[PDB]
């Protein structure tokens, strides 16, 4: 879980607006997973990298 961009997000399905306790998927057998089917393209860190070098 990340802390900053957004206060918090449903740790159940991974969708904002509601909490794991108020998550809809709860009352469902077949639901989607995470944000999308795609997890990553092929990079370690694109933005997560905040490292800076003056030289
Ligand atoms: Zn949810």
From Swiss-Prot:
A zinc finger (CCHC-type) spans 8-25. Phosphorylated by NEK6. It is found in: Nucleus, Nucleolus; Chromosome; Cytoplasm, Cytoskeleton, Microtubule organizing center, Centrosome. Highly expressed in the placenta and testis. Expressed at lower levels in the brain, heart, kidney, liver and lung. Overexpressed in esophageal cancer. Transmembrane segments: none annotated. E3 ubiquitin-protein ligase which promotes ubiquitination of YBX1, leading to its degradation by the proteasome. May play a role as a scaffold protein to promote the assembly of the p53/TP53-MDM2 complex, resulting in increase of MDM2-mediated ubiquitination and degradation of p53/TP53; may function as negative regulator of p53/TP53, leading to both apoptosis and cell growth. Regulates DNA-replication and the stability of chromosomal common fragile sites (CFSs) in a ZBTB38- and MCM10-dependent manner. Interacts with p53/TP53 and RB1. Interacts also with MDM2 and YBX1. Interacts with NEK6. Interacts with ZBTB38. (Microbial infection) [Isoform 1]: Interacts with ebolavirus VP30. Contains a N-terminus DWNN domain, a zinc-finger domain and a C4C4 zinc-binding RING finger domain. The ring finger may indeed be a U-box domain. This is E3 ubiquitin-protein ligase RBBP6. It comes from Homo sapiens. The chain holds residues 159 to 206 of 1792 of the full protein.
């Amino acid at each position: 879980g990340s802390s900053g961009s957004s206060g918090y997000t449903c740790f159940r399905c991974g969708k904002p607006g509601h909490y794991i306790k108020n998550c809809p998927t709860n009352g469902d057998k077949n639901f989607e997973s995470g944000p999308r089917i795609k997890k990553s393209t092929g990079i370690p860190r694109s933005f997560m990298m905040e490292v800076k070098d003056p030289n």
